[PDB]
Amino acid sequence: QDLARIEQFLDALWLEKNLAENTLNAYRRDLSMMVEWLHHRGLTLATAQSDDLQALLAERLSSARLLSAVRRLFQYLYREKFREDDPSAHLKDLSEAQVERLLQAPLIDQPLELRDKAMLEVLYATGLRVSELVGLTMSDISLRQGVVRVIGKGNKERLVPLGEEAVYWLETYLEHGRPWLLNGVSIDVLFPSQRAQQMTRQTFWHRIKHYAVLAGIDSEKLSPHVLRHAFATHLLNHGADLRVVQMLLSDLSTTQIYTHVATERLRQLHQ
C-alpha cells in the first residue's frame, strides 16, 4: 500500500509536466529506501513522524535530494488528505454548497461554458486531474461504454468509468458545445479552446476561478487539491452508482476515494 502510494505520487508528480524521469527515479529510489527504512522501524507512511524523518536523513549524509523527495511526498499526502499533517514541514476549505454552486455556475447555452460544464462533471466524477482532462482526445472516449481512456507515466493506459451524469453532460456537450467551438476545424482534442486549439491546465484553471468566483468561493485561494478533495467527498456523499462504497469505506483520502469509485463503477460495467 505504501509503495503504491509512491507510484501514485510520482504519477501525480509526472502529471504536472515537471521534473524528469531522472529526478523521478531518484525520487522512486529515495522514497522506497525511506519506506523500507520506516517499515523496518515499525512505522508507516501514515505514522512516520518528523523525528523519524529527522533520523532517516541523518542515517548517512544525498541529504538534499533525499530531503527533496521526502518533502514533496509528504506535501503530497497532506494535500491528498492521506494524513492530516505534513510530518516533513519543519525538516479542506470548501463546503458542499460551494461545490454545488460552482458546478451550477457554467451557463449551458454558451458552447464554451458547456465545455467547461462537461470538464467539471468529468473532474467531479472520475477524479482525473485538470492535466489529464485537457489532453484527452476524441479517441479517449466511449460514452456508450461509459469510460474515458487515460494515458499515464509509461504508456500506462487505463480506463476510468465516467458514471451516468458525466456521460450525460459529455453527450450534451458533444451535441451542443464542441461542434460550435470547432466550426468544422478538425482537431482530435476532446475539449478545445474557443479558437479551436488544445487548451492547457492553466488556461482551464482560469475558467475554474471564474466559476469559483460566481459561487462565492475565494478564487485566488482555491487550489487543485482542495477542489479535487471537495469533489471526491461530495461525490462519495451523494453519487448514485456508488451505493455502498460508503459502506465499505473512515479518514478518506482523495485518491483512495476515487480508486474505490473507479473500482465499483468498472465492476458494474463489466456486469
Residue type, 8: Q
Q: Are 175 and 109 in contact (CB under 8 A)?
A: no
Q: Are 134 and 198 in contact (CB under 8 A)?
A: yes
Residue written as grid cell 483512495:
256
Whole-number Å distance between alpha carbons of 49 and 84: 12
Task: Answer yes or no: 270 catalytic.
Answer: no
Q: Are 177 and 118 in contact (CB under 8 A)?
A: yes
3-state secondary structure of 215: coil
Residue whose C-alpha is closest to residue 233's, from 221, 210, 250, 217: 250
- 141 is in which domain, residue-wise? 92-271
Residue whose C-alpha is closest to residue 72's, from 57, 83, 88: 88
Q: Among residues 5, 225, 260, 265, which one is catalytic?
A: 225
Task: Answer yes or no: 129 catalytic.
Answer: yes
Residues 27 and 45 in one domain: yes
Q: Are 13 and 24 in contact (CB under 8 A)?
A: yes
Residues 216 and 120 in one domain: yes
* Resolution, expressed in angstroms to one decimal: 2.5
Q: In the PDB record, what is the listed experimental method?
A: X-ray
Q: Among residues 81, 207, 228, 229, which one is catalytic?
A: 228
Whole-number Å distance between alpha carbons of 101 and 25: 41
Q: Are 92 and 254 in contact (CB under 8 A)?
A: no
Domain count, the chain: 2
Task: Answer yes or no: 178 catalytic.
Answer: no
Residues 221 and 113 in one domain: yes
| Residue 151, beta-bridge partner list | 157
Task: Answer yes or no: 258 catalytic.
Answer: yes
Q: For residue 53, how far is the Cα from the chain centroid?
A: 27
Q: Among residues 72, 81, 117, 129, which one is catalytic?
A: 129
Q: Among residues 71, 101, 153, 209, which one is catalytic?
A: 153
Q: For residue 34, how far is the Cα from the chain centroid?
A: 25
Residues 60 and 114 in one domain: no
Here the CATH number for the domain that contains residue 49 is 1.10.150.130
Residues 129 and 170 in one domain: yes
Q: Among residues 124, 173, 211, 258, which one is catalytic?
A: 258
Residues 44 and 170 in one domain: no
Q: Using CB atoms within 10 A of its CB, is residue 236 exposed (0-12), middle (13-18) or buried (19+)?
A: middle
C-alpha distance from residue 95 to each of 28, 99, 230 (Å): 35, 6, 8
Whole-number Å distance between alpha carbons of 228 and 94: 10
Dihedral pair phi/psi, residue 142, rounded to 5°: -145, 100
Residues 125 and 226 in one domain: yes
Residues 54 and 142 in one domain: no
Whole-number Å distance between alpha carbons of 66 and 64: 5
Residue written as grid cell 532517516:
56
